[PDB]
Design goal:
This is part of a larger assembly, with chains A (70 residues) and B (58 residues). By secondary structure, chain A is low in regular secondary structure. Helix content of chain A is 0%, strand content 9%. Chain B has no helices and two strands. The chains are: A little secondary structure (70), B mainly beta (58). The structure holds zinc ion. Chain A binds one RNA strand of 569 nucleotides through strand 1. Chain B: It is found in: Cytoplasm.
RNA sequence: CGGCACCUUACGAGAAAUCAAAGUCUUUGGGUUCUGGGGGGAGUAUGGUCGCAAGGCUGAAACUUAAAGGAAUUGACGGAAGGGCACCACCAGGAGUGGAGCCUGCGGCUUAAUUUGACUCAACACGGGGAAACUCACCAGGUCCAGACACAAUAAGGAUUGACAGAUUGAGAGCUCUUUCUUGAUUUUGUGGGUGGUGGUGCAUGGCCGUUCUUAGUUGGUGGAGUGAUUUGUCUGCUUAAUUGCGAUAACGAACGAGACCUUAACCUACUAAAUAGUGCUGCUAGCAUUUGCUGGUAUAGUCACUUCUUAGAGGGACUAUCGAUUUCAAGUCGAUGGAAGUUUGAGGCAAUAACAGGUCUGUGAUGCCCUUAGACGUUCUGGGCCGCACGCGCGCUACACUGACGGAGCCAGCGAGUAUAAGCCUUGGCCGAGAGGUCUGGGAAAUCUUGUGAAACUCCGUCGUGCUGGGGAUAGAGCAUUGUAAUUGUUGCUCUUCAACGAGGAAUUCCUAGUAAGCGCAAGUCAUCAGCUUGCGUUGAUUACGUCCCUGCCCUUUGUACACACCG
């Protein structure tokens, strides 16, 4: 029996950030070499190999299991 | 009496119907076989032939 | 003879009311004069004619309209007559309400929302509506898709979901913003399509309820009246709680409703049995006068007896029984004796033909349709509000004092409820606490245990002693507990403290005839706490009627109608 009105500006729900070929940033394929694995996959037992962290500012996080190191 | 009420849904509204029925009281097998006020009278056994004073030895 | 008429009947006539003419008229003819041709316009205009005038006589059309009207039937309605019934009427009475305070609902006012429905009976302690989250439909802010399913776009080189820390935000809602992390074709955009709403529409509805009215009314078969719609049956009088019966009777016999019926209450020393009931005995045990008794405890083996009191299944019993009276000597009524019960034995449940703009779309996965449906009127979450008060109204209570307050002593009911890996039930009994409350056990899934719910009024014994007193308990201040995530706008109680109006209430008006009214408490409900409320129970226990139509209301008959969407015409 009333018309609803807002005050704050309309929000936009967060969209997943599309990264072009995300897998490239995890390895540096050496010529006549081995796999690099520079990104130091999370040592939690839940995520084994192939699941890497995030070399962010002052924290290292993997989205598989919600933990951070330093 | 057995009573049944069902709502019939038409495109324009609801049709609530009630089909109220009776079976024959004399056809009842477990409860009373008639109405409470049902008074049944049997027939007379009078108008017999009476004779003065006989005696039958059996 | 002539009249003015009147009564019955209908040979006959009539659409019928009716008619001795309105008959002797489709079996159409005694003479003759006048008049009408759907309703209005309209007895109007014009012309003529008569009149002092007012007016009379003669007298259209255009246009407009599907009806206007007659007699009667049913119903509805009446500011009409006659009857009947009723403590939702009165007579005679009892208790009240209406005076103050409070609780609560209503309108009103304010509000951010103070949600809203309902407004004589038939609105206002009602929505089982005693609202902290929830309820909530409202307000300020926040989320999610829990948008199924077909497609089109995108999309594995990733459609996209979840997200540590900080900022934001109330939030440790990755809600979003800084952040580069992680799953992977369930998923992202649009279309259809949906779906969900305490949104609106009870004046679009179902289903239920209330009301008419739980009043006693309703209906057909055959016959009779009538051309018919209809009517009689279904009614003067009496009787009954009653259309229930007697009776009268163009009616006769029937059906629904009422009554019967069912639940509950009473009686049963007569049955069936009762260790989840009791009793008398029987043990063993106790205190007193010792009289062998009076009181008790115990006894799931005293392997006692019984159903009488308590339970409930089978039954029985009352049908106005018998008698005195009145009555149409009928239906009944009134007085006795018996009886347990003689008011339908008491009180309730179900309850007719159709119907209402009675109430509800706020209970529904009951709904049609309008609105909306991703920044949701959907949901979720936090905080608020329904409580908010310049006012009037009602359902209740507290009382206004001595037929009383406190303080002791005594101390009897009945209806009911109560649980497990829970989300905590009834809680005893013991232990702490002035109180409220706190701790530890145990019984009961139940006639066992809670609980003999030892309820209060009440009876007694004391103070108080007419004072607003010690009647009354508003308004307010301090602490301790309880419940809940959360008690502030006191949940509630408890302890102390404050010590209000009220000294019986106007005009008015309500309920009620016997365990009924009225005092008095108790339980179940909503409920985690909250009962001044309802629903039921039990305790004490009356006054006066046992009549009437004076008021009011309803019903029936007569009557009237230009109403039938029915006087809100
Ligand atoms: Zn990890």
């Amino acid at each position: 029996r009333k018309k609803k009105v807002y005050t704050t500006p309309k929000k936009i729900k967060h969209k997943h950030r599309k990264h072009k070929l995300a897998v490239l940033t995890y390895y540096k394929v050496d010529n006549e070499g081995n796999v690099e694995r520079l990104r130091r996959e999370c040592p939690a037992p839940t995520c084994g190999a192939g699941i890497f962290m995030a070399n962010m500012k002052d924290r290292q996080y993997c989205g598989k299991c919600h933990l951070t190191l330093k | 009496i057995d009573i049944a009420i069902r709502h019939v849904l038409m495109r324009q509204g609801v049709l609530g119907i009630k089909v109220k029925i009776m079976k024959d009281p004399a056809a009842n097998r477990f409860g009373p076989r008639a109405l409470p006020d049902a008074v049944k009278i049997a027939e007379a056994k009078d108008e017999d032939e009476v004779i003065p004073a006989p005696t039958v030895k059996s």
